[PDB]
Amino acid sequence: ASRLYTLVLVLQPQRVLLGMKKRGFGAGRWNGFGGKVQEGETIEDGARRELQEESGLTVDALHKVGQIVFEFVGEPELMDVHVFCTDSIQGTPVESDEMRPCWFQLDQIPFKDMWPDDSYWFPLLLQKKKFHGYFKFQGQDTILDYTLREVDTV
Numbered sequence: 001a002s003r004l005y006t007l008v009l010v011l012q013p014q015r016v017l018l019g020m021k022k023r024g025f026g027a028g029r030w031n032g033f034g035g036k037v038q039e040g041e042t043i044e045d046g047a048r049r050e051l052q053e054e055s056g057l058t059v060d061a062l063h064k065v066g067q068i069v070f071e072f073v074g075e076p077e078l079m080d081v082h083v084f085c086t087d088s089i090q091g092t093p094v095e096s097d098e099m100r101p102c103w104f105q106l107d108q109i110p111f112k113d114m115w116p117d118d119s120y121w122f123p124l125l126l127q128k129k130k131f132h133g134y135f136k137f138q139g140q141d142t143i144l145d146y147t148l149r150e151v152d153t154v
């Protein structure tokens with residue numbers, strides 16, 4: 001009972017790009033760029049498409065960094081999130097009515113204004129580690145339990 005999602009982090013040596021969502025899933029939080037994978041579309045193509053739709057950036061090389069499954073108690077569908085990273089992009093981030101992008105210095109990541117699970121796996125992401133994770137939520141703010149392991153292959 002899982003649904004595929006992508007999440008792209010534009011991570012450069014001294015900064016990361018995040019987008020403040022204006023409405024829908026994750027509204028009011030800084031997030032990476034992503035969404036549902038379409039019929040007949042590979043996970044990687046879905047990740048490239050979402051990055052452009054949401055941030056206006058064109059990604060050249062994408063690297064698979066993680067897989068995280070999210071469960072919301074009472075919600076049947078698990079989110080199977082395939083996490084990607086890039087340092088090679090083209091264009092300038094575009095602010096739209098749906099998304100407000102901003103660059104953050106690595107020591108200034110806004111964890112208090114991000115999904116709570118991010119505080120757990122972003123430190124791995126920053127140290128170029130790959131991971132498999134699972135987070136059980138009750139509502140949007142509480143993590144009931146989780147698992148998070150470093151892996152050699154995503």
Ligand SMILES: Cc1cc(OCCCO)nc(N)n1
Pocket residue numbers: 005006007033034035036070079081115117118
């Ligand atoms: C609970 C949760 C879900 C999520 O979903 C990202 C899917 C791509 O839009 N991303 C995070 N960081 N946390």
